[model samples]
Target chain A: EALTTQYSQSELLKNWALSHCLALVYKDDVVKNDARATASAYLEYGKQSVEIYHEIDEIAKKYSGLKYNGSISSDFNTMKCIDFIHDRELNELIKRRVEK
Target chain B: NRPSFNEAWLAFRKVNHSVADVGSIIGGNVGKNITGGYFQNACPIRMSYVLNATGFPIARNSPYAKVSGADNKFYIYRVNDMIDYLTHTMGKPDLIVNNPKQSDFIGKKGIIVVKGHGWSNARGHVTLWNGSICSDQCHLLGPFVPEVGTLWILP
Candidate 1:
């Protein structure tokens, strides 16, 4: 029996796209109203983000010297999942409650 | 009172952003970054504080630097030192450079670091043990190579 599971680059990209959309929308929803949902949303977002990373390295198999971590992806116009602004507002709310 | 690992850990947990948000290079996530520049370096820096009370300390050897913040304070950590902290000081790896059994790691609490190879250059990512493997930050699949290893954090 095989203990390891494998995912294709295409599948990984598709998954990343879907989760990315959910993270954006979910965060937006929470920012406007529910802070309670924020933690779960961030949790899912973190999950998907790591999966995207896993996929990138998998795809990197074909190309050499491509460091996906910090080597690329940082233009709001480019990556498109620009939730930092809203994330800041949302986090402030959480921080007020969560921290001193 | 002296700060404990729990205090450093509480601080790390207090970070508002997810791995994706900090891991992101461009977009709102970057702007949301609290660590300043070098997104990839951010998590490792935070993790260093988890081990050391004062802060992520200076490395005695190569591949380390100081990254400053808008607060005018700077953070210094050896890239290798952080990795060593995660793998050695944190916990003994159940396995490394060999395929780990699903039954072995499933439901275990700890971190997973992918080894550098044809794909990933090894990032120490925080994830819980799921049936197949660890999943985090809007990601469904696990790291490129599970054979690289999984370290079960000390409980």
Candidate 2:
């Protein structure tokens, strides 16, 4: 039996991604002008968040069954990740939030 | 009349230092109420506030311009879009320097865009540089290392 509470790396990443997405949505709502522009900016942020989510997911896969303990670097990387828009899990979350 | 760096700096200095205070100045709760905390990412909004207070309001035609509140004035919230406006619309593309050094920014009145660190990499951060890097809040001059992105000096 497990005595201590712990979360998987993917679980922690999903929570963080959700919070970031909500913040982006809040910003989108606050702007409240140029509907198209607001939507586009939200989409851009969403894309970034999805990329981060996937990167975290890859780490989880690599470390399989490991607890998250600062595996991600605090330093920023210059390269952009690709194909985030096609991410099903992230897309589902985005759709639910944005559509409402 | 062209926008004055002196006026912009004056406005920036007048901005409230507290995060909540700065949030209110932006005409919303942008700084205080953000889900994951917006203080670190509020550089662009602070820059826009400075520009607005200095009579260099964002142009309505720009894609980034968002009608903020009842004032009907346009505000820019993205660093990239702000750079676009400052360069293309303001016609100061000649002033932009990529990967600027500390000397390039010290004692100068202009805008500096730093590529965001960590999860914020998707976006960038923009801050006004007078003697030090500051916005709604001020950072004292020191061995502050920034991931230098772009710098646009006001003429």
Candidate 3:
């Protein structure tokens, strides 16, 4: 029963794409708005991955170990900019809980 | 400008109450529209996973009281700012909020996934890395890794 994440490749592409863009601007290390921007991207991307992983895991939970991901390496799997919209739309399908 | 002030302010207040929808959006998620539209994804599902933002978070201002529909508002608590209850305290927040045209993500999870993506292929060779979550329940807690690298996945 491995915990497989529901995060799609394209979705991962989107987030990594943002990071790629940021890396271009702040190569070595991020700072100021750059830092916040990168932080925003990474922190949020990390969260997104965890959430989908949880959902997929709920139904299919059986994996060895989990890896957060490295800084500047070859392997990368995060949300992209396109499919993220679809992910949001799917959320609307969830049970809404709004009222006074 | 007193009479005009009363009329205009009252008008503003009427408008405020109409849109002071913090309670209106009691439990539904928030910000999918903002992210996808204003910035990137605008992906509700991706955003649905965002959570943990309790009070005046990232891009949100605090809620408003009495008047309602306040925007970009925060608190400035002093040392002995002793404020009252029925009389309204000075900075005993959570009692009042003030962000308008805002999305209050009260989803089961917590945060709203801002911008990110993930897609598993053929469901093959995906040695437990990460995933694409619904937008509403997304909350950034920590890394998705273990202690060592070898302990991770094959590829």
Residue-pair clashes per candidate, as listed? 20, 0, 73
Taking chain A of model 2 alone, its TM-score versus the true chain A equals 0.27
| Local accuracy by lDDT, each model | 0.37, 0.46, 0.23
Which candidate achieves the best DockQ against the true structure? Answer: 2
Per-residue lDDT of model 1, residues B1-155, tens digit only: 12343454455554425534533422332323322221333445445434333354434342433333333333332234456555544456654535544555555444555433232212334433334544333132334444455554434
Tens digit per residue, CA lDDT, model 2, B6-70? 77777766654543455566554343232223233344556667777778777666666342523
- Where does candidate 3 chain A have its weakest 10-residue lDDT segment? A57-66
Q: How many steric overlaps does candidate 2 have?
A: 0
> Candidate 2, clashing residue pairs?
none
Number of the top-ranking candidate, with lDDT as the measure: 2
DockQ of each: 0.03, 0.06, 0.02
Give me the candidate number with maximum TM-score.
Answer: 2
Error of 3 at B5 (Å): 40
Error of 2 at A57 (Å): 24
TM-score ranking from best candidate downward: 2, 1, 3
Model 2 Cα lDDT, one tens digit per residue, A1-100? 1111133333333444433333333325544223223233333333132234334344323323223334576221111112222346554543444212
C-alpha RMSD for every candidate: 16.1, 13.1, 22.5
